[PDB]
Amino acid sequence: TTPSMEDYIEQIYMLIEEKGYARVSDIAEALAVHPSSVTKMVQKLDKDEYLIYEKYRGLVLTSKGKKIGKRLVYRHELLEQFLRIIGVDEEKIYNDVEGIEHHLSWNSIDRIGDLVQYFEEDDARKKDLKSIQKKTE
Amino acid sequence: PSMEDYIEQIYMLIEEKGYARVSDIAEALAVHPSSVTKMVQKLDKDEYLIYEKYRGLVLTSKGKKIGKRLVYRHELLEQFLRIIGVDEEKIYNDVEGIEHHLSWNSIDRIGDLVQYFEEDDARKKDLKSIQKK
Numbered sequence: 001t002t003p004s005m006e007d008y009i010e011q012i013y014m015l016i017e018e019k020g021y022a023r024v025s026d027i028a029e030a031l032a033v034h035p036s037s038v039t040k041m042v043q044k045l046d047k048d049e050y051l052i053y054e055k056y057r058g059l060v061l062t063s064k065g066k067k068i069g070k071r072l073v074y075r076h077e078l079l080e081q082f083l084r085i086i087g088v089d090e091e092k093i094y095n096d097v098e099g100i101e102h103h104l105s106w107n108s109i110d111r112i113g114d115l116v117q118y119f120e121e122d123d124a125r126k127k128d129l130k131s132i133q134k135k136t137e
Numbered sequence: 138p139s140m141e142d143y144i145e146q147i148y149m150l151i152e153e154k155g156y157a158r159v160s161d162i163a164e165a166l167a168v169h170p171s172s173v174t175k176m177v178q179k180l181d182k183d184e185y186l187i188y189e190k191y192r193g194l195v196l197t198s199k200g201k202k203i204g205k206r207l208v209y210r211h212e213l214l215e216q217f218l219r220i221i222g223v224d225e226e227k228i229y230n231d232v233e234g235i236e237h238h239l240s241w242n243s244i245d246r247i248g249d250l251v252q253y254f255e256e257d258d259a260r261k262k263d264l265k266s267i268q269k270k
């Protein structure tokens with residue numbers, strides 16, 4: 001799976017979890033691309049069996065597509081929580097996550113997963129971390 | 138991203154051999170020499186380095202400033218992933234991939250994280266605990 005493919009899958013998954021479906025035009029708007037670019041990537045996803053570009057129903061995900069989408073949306077959310085927890089400006093989080101989510105091994109993602117749990121488990125740890133952020137003196 | 142990789146490698150080559158040859162850059166980044174030459178022309182125009190008559194490529198004060206920074210970012214990210222327990226064999230490839238898509242704000246916060254764990258070994262142990270759980 002290429003990085004741009006992961007973005008589409010992430011996007012289609014979220015659209016269905018919200019509107020209950022995913023239209024080519026909704027995808028092009030969300031990723032800010034021309035519908036032809038979308039249609040092209042869709043056929044590839046259809047051939048790789050992540051979804052079906054069916055008639056009447058439209059864009060439907062296969063078990064394989066729901067499995068991957070679920071993991072990709074989870075990956076994105078975990079990375080956001082991660083940056084948020086260590087004190088990154090909120091306005092800079094989405095852009096950083098969108099860029100790095102694709103270049104991280106599941107191994108790293110799981111380790112980031114334990115770190116997040118590490119800080120959520122004891123608030124006293126967050127305070128210690130934030131205190132070190134004031135050691136810039 | 139790719140332009141940053143170049144600046145990153147060039148800096149390291151000079152901090153090692155004391156200079157950087159086109160051939161050495163092509164090999165480090167596993168690319169064709171014709172491809173490296175094209176990038177060198179751009180970096181030169183942008184005033185990061187300079188092709189000197191008989192000295193190969195030399196970095197300007199700007200190139201040195203940027204390069205030192207990119208090597209630091211790379212090393213910091215490596216220690217970070219190592220500290221939280223990532224398989225050492227998978228560290229280099231992840232850092233190479235993510236280093237270009239991280240704001241300095243993010244880098245600075247990660248630097249504080251590494252420092253957090255470094256000042257108390259008890260913390261690394263608690264983190265290692267959750268891993269087993």
Ligand SMILES: [Mn+2]
Pocket residue numbers: 007097098099101102
């Ligand atoms: Mn993305």
Ligand SMILES: [Mn+2]
Pocket residue numbers: 010076097098101
């Ligand atoms: Mn994402």
Ligand SMILES: [Mn+2]
Pocket residue numbers: 142232233234236237
């Ligand atoms: Mn890189």
Ligand SMILES: [Mn+2]
Pocket residue numbers: 145211232233236
């Ligand atoms: Mn690097």
